[model samples]
Target: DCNYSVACNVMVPMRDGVRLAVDLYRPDADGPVPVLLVRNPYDKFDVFAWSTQSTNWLEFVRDGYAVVIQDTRGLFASEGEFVPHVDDEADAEDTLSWILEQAWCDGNVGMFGVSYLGVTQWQAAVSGVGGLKAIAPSMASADLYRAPWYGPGGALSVEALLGWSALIGTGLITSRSDARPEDAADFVQLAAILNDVAGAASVTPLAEQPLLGRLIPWVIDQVVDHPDNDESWQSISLFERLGGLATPALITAGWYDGFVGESLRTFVAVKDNADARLVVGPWSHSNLTGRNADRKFGIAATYPIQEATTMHKAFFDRHLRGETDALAGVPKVRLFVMGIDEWRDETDWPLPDTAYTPFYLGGSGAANTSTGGGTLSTSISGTESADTYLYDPADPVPSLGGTLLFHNGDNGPADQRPIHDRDDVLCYSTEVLTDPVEVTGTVSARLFVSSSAVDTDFTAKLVDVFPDGRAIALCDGIVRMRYRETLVNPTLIEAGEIYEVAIDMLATSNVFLPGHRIMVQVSSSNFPKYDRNSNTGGVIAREQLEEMCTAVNRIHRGPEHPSHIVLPIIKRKL
Candidate 1:
């Protein structure tokens, strides 16, 4: 390692007079160097807390670049009110400019971090700042609206919202400089509620909940007060709006990560830029350890940010330092293949050779079972049939696992066998495969559905059925009836009137081996991961828990009203 020095707790003042804390690590070389910056709301000192595998910034110092890790405004050592992403762009712009004025910086700056850290990267990259050069917005999405906020079809992500709010609220309350001894009881009560976000997930009239009502008040205004995806989220939500970013980007994601699909959407927005690239591993948002709740791909599958940097550093080297050969051998995309547990370098997403094949859901009309009870095939039924079930908001299906953050549910591949026998779920699975079927792209379920309420939600999960009957969910998506046609406006359907809706189960890369089967689990809810639609439709957030209606939801099947899953199938034998 080259010689380096460190400066901790440096208070850099922003234009608004608020000071942000940063830890700077720089090379001891005489010549000024380009900087690699990390602007994160989470504490900057702890190496492993925020994004799980936060970069060992000092490792970059020896690589001849200065590294700055700053606590975002109103976070940690910073002095101010933390209003989420509101002040990020200006603060990042000021911070980068301050770095440029330093005697040690050669003007070029690049940023990297995960989740909200990645959010900060996008903030500065779009600032038209001359000093910022590139960024690696890993494990996060610029399309913050559909992800990190609401799920597909404008359904609010319950666990991700309330869970994350509680987490940040803890810091917000603790970091206050004006806390009085009288606030101790309030803090204690908040802490008690925060400690059980899992249990709090069951609370209805969610706006009236504890920490969110007081600590993260804005979240209540945006999510609880205005549940629909509308004008309220305009300033913070990045839809198809990455056109403002001019910086070279290297996007990183996880197969089972909550925001993987959003990350891909971001890459698509900036694909016109030749320098933009993507890498998707079989990891979760916080668990970059190459393994997850129920499976381990292998050590090679890991992207250890703490170790001597390689891919991301190589990416930054190209843009920030003009090292032409840094990523000479890198491909446009790199994906980790689960089931086989191998990393494959590809040229594009939804791989060019992918066959967009549809697997239809059909059976004896009663498809609820842990074992195979329904039929999934390439054949289209000539007649109409419906699998009917009641969705009670109070007793919605519990969220077992899948790309979750905080306390809503577990993250990564989780077994779905526990609830498979419930009459509320419909499990349609294909016969055991004699040959491997490789599915490696974004997946979706187009279902002809109807509900007995003005507004409800339909959830679909793509599962990998093991030879031993383990139904492990790879990815899932939900669509709220009121926002089914478009997220911008609400248009609830009449009771029993059938309509086709698409549930983007997001993306996954897995192989259903010879003896295993491919399954699609259809239901009305995946609670905690997403909020239970009250089915009352009239301002759901305001609907009391006791007022929720039990809607009878149905999934129709036939040639005209065909319900099927579209899998991006690439033949391994070919």
Candidate 2:
């Protein structure tokens, strides 16, 4: 460990005349050391989350390196217009160039951070810039369109996007050097609304906002105007252009964070070609403390013990410091499997030993609420009556647990029984497990669905039901009807026509102990977490409350039209 000096509020010039504000931490070394560069739109000084892992900066210096954290162009102390999706790639290049020029002068560089900071790291690594040797991107995804701003099926994630505008973006907007008088009133409105994020989430025509459009035009332009996964989003989608990732990367994800779906997707895309390592633990975006709901996964599951520093330091050492043995024999994949609550090393993702087993949805007609007769079993139902629920745009199902961001008291594995108790949610659960059932890889669902409206949405969630009646959500996903076929083109559905829609709940690593049950909850809306579908086949961002219609959505469960969830189970039930 070495003593370090910090250069705060140091403005580094980007290629554009605009300069980004950065905090430089240099170790008291005889010569230069490899630079650990972090760039985020979140204020460089307003550091909390990721710094626990890499910063306040000295913890990284303790491991023998230089650290530079910068506010990306347009936000915080940085000088420029705060444009979100489009600026990162260029800003990443400029920042790396600036890092090399400084006599802190190591030719090698690595990037690390969580959430938006992780996103900037993705941009730098993918820009194929020289000297960027490696990166540790955690709790974030490059799949901005599908994962963060927009829901997987073209719906906007109101809370993470617009709520972010209110909760966090208010300060970011008011801080801009270009702030105007009119913006002040909007900021005041946002301040009140942010105190209750869920309260404001119910607003109709969600994105047609004063604060979002004025403060961040991109949110309205891309989210409201263009709902499809079109060319407009590729500017920010690392999913579209991942071939550029050539540097060694250490990708980290939290099972409960909103971005874990894409974090793993991004990892597997580049893992075959690039030297990528994946580590996933049971964590929400807010809490890196290894505890979720009423459970804790022991000391080893904490940030410092697992990631935030230890893994990042080791990975950076091997790649940036040229210490080949730093991560000697380290597993390419390290997962903190929940149920068992143990950290285990694995060779590859979708663990080669996985068995993709389908737990078919079976029930008598009524699966409306938790009390309704929805059943889950290994045997497919030959022919069963369809289950239906009325999905009113107003009074839609509230979001509970599983991969939400910020406050609202529902982030990680909160008891989802409250949501299951609703009339709109259809719950299909397995019999109490007599043997431990381990699910480790991709958790996806296929449903033969029919809807009353030309456009609507279908949502699926995997839950672990405790003996005490607590239903904890594992992973959940949404699919808007129009974009069910493809993200590029949206084809409206023919009313009453049954179509096979794949709902990707993404991946999760969990085990249901004996007496616990596995469940799949099907619903039409997961509001706030995802904006309620108007069921009118209209422009998502432009739909008014009056125009929204109630959808009579159906889930067919006959063998030919089987609605089922494919869990990546480890052992055979038979």
Candidate 3:
């Protein structure tokens, strides 16, 4: 009756008797086929509406493959109490095992998705589940404790926590309860709390409820329980369990995407355990597949849609079906060079033939601020001193378009032109390039600093300044001075003692074209993008210390403190 056409069905399986609904799209042929599975709480049918076409779902089906999209253990058509961000190790293992046993599947499987969906694939792979072969996790956050939700020094990730809790967390609770639609208004109200600073506090009201507010308490507990790197977060970090995952992996991300750093970390951590490849484009989290609006910076822009899709299809085919045509001769790393406005391939991330160059900060105290008094030179020093700024939380450096987070459409390349004009931001630049210099790997900031406060945070941003003087941020990262020595074993600053703090500015892959300049921004706070580290040294989330004290931060560029920006330059004859 249904020849050549796949029929849809609603199946209720007790994953340990907790039923989950799955939407199966398969050929009506009598023979079994390999499974391309994705388990996520985000709406399975949520149309991938970017412009006129929707490609995320249709691409797989057109490639002569079967796609199985499930609603996780909760939410949507799944029949079970919904829980947001719970441990998916057991759930993914049990769920995939159930799928493989089905008659429709041939017991062969691969997983794919982005963001939350991306995390699911990693968790499933780490479970050492049978029949799970290749996976492509794009813009997925690893080391949840250190990446998206909370930071290395226990800085509350206001954006991630608020957005995820309101969207997914609230949605799960509402779908699980037996309350009337009128009573379910609470989730809507909770969702709206995203617009306020005390938004997380609203979740506390649901702590006592049984069926209606189970998810909220779990989130609140996360905020209250693990204030620092502890055993609780260690249990969920995939970084600690990288040895267990041996699946062939393709990792990709964008420069401005919040998860870019984690994507690189996954590659390095699992390099020895699996076949790993990485790609960093000029797109953001939502535009990984190049489905968003055309993003531009200076004279550069993204490639056409057809080119983007072809790259993705070729990657999947090579690893999944063993097709060696387009994927053949592919480099270990592919990066979109922004200033050069071209794409280049590299044999490895953090290129093997690169030098670590230190750019010293010099000039008077007034020169330190953005009025262009500071000088950035490759000169070596022994006892040189740079101007220090008093970072006050009350007057945090206003965010001016550098690695910012919001609902803006054109949010890809962080244009630092506006930020470079600010007094709070200290910008230092290298000499203009005469030859194409490519940097492809993790960027770092070594600061020889001292703080007046007991505890504080220091932030660094690596930027690519164009010939036209447009400063675009390539990657940025922060380090809480207290966690300067150890992330887990934190210690207060020595009040005024010079200390070397190594700040991992995550990873970036770019080429600074000839005529363009390389710039580095040194500052204390990048507000709202990261929680303000109340210079008074108080705990995050638990207390926002109103009393703000000034801290003197030094950038030493002398023989004693040779602070610098280290770039992983790819192999090239100069």
Candidate 4:
């Protein structure tokens, strides 16, 4: 219905006098149209360059909308220094003001993008920018300290942090060829440091990690200085400020994406105040398909690329154009239920009628590995013993699958039987289920634990055990011992004292079939995915090899010390 016209490298000046480079695409016949803005650190050219895979911008253009993609400060052709999310609010505000003044832009504006692009939308929305009407943020989180980037357990995410840094660092070296002669050596050095990402990540006392410590210093600064939930970390977090946001949001997330937990939390937080809709698919951080390495949820599990673009158009049309029928039939929450492999719509999250069930951990003292005999039961009338494992920082268990990003390892559901075979991973499971058990909400575990070392980590994972003996991980979480009570208030433990700590395994929706077994794996580490705890009670990022110690970790399960997992079970209709 419209012809697309493009304008390249149209520089827009900011309040601080720094001009940002933006590419504007508009309908040729437009007098004035609602604007769809996408702001990101990733080069704006790449947005339209990947035409074969992406459809949002083209769809918006066809639907009679003006699209603008801008390069964030200090990246590509944009001016000013880029310090991540810190400067986004002010920059977005200035950009929005400029757009409103333009002759081709209507008074209304909507923001859209995935990952860092999504993050920019959130930052802009929180700035209370006028004319910003709606947002569609996919695979993004409002909190920088938790989920996607770092764990709530107070551990640095080595794979995600280091991999993402290296990616951006490499991009910087290649994209910014206008660097001075003196800066050429620094760029080459940075390129080399990022070239061996694994080697850079393996460097202990992170402050000495070559280019990361000097060139991209913020990476180390966040890990060392803001290890806990402090003021510095919370400054950019949209969690506490969600209630004040008036802009409607269309949040999309993948079950296996790094920010799935935070995405769900964001939807739940803002749904009460504004018109918020969430779409969670059986995909990873990037893919929207039903297929992964060894698992397939069927063709129905895939989120159609064109359909998503159409959905965005509808969202924008309803909010920015006052089209009532655009979102008329849309559900509050659209989720892809795994195991059964079907999509379902729900009115609320944690489903209003959820029946929270507890499965107690019952095991023999020898439950050190998968074959060591551990059980999950409703009745814990019998006497139970504790299982112990030695956690050595030198040989930590590697991350297998689940929600992971930055290409550190495989992601999504995968056979976890190999991980369970390790002596460090304690596996507990229920007898074969006679009836289907559907768990569809937040998953958490409580552990009565003790350690021989001053500090350590206790990890928990929910598993789906097949009759053929393949144990696939569904979701997992880790809790650092020092951060038992709160992330900010870390307190080291007495050598042998028992402490009850809760591990937030995040959320998942799956139906354990009749022949399947519900399982839980307890361990001390999931390396590279999360930084290993040295068990020395020293500063995590500053600790040296001498500070690393082997921890003798114990999980007690008895009448006095009842360790259990809580599942949100939804009863099947008769």
* Alpha carbon lDDT of each predicted model: 0.80, 0.81, 0.65, 0.82
Model 3 ranges with Cα > 4 A deviation: 1-9, 12-15, 47-56, 152-154, 173-215, 287-326, 364-366, 400-410, 421-423, 571-574
Model 1 root mean square deviation, Cα atoms: 2.1
> Candidate 3 lDDT, tens digit per residue, 129-214?
76776777776766887767666545555555555566665566556547656546666565455554233332222223232234
Ranking 1 against 2 by lDDT, winner: 2
lDDT of 2 by residue, 1-574 (tens): 5788888989888787888899988888768889988887667776674477443445678666888888877777888887775888888888888888888868999988888888888778777678988888887787888777776667777778766666556766557577567777877787776776777777667766776677667667776677788888776777756765577878888888878888998888788777889888888877777866656678787865434466677787888888879988778999989888888888999798898998999877688888898999989987767998899998888888777785463358778877767888999998899999999998889999999999998999999898888888888898888889888888899999999999888789998999999988999998778888888888766767887899898999978888899999887455
TM-score of each: 0.95, 0.94, 0.86, 0.95
* Candidate 1 residue-wise lDDT, 132-234, digit = tens: 8888888787656777878666777777887678778767767778886756776666566567655676776776766567777778866667666678667
Model 4: residues >4 Å from true position, as ranges?
48-55, 179-199
In terms of lDDT, which candidate is stronger, 1 or 4? 4
Between the candidate structures 3 and 4, which one is better when assessed by lDDT?
4
Model 2 CA RMSD to the hidden true structure, in angstroms:
2.3
lDDT of 2 at 364: 75
**Backbone steric clashes in candidate 1, count:** 0
Error of 1 at 33 (Å): 0.8
TM-score of 4: 0.95
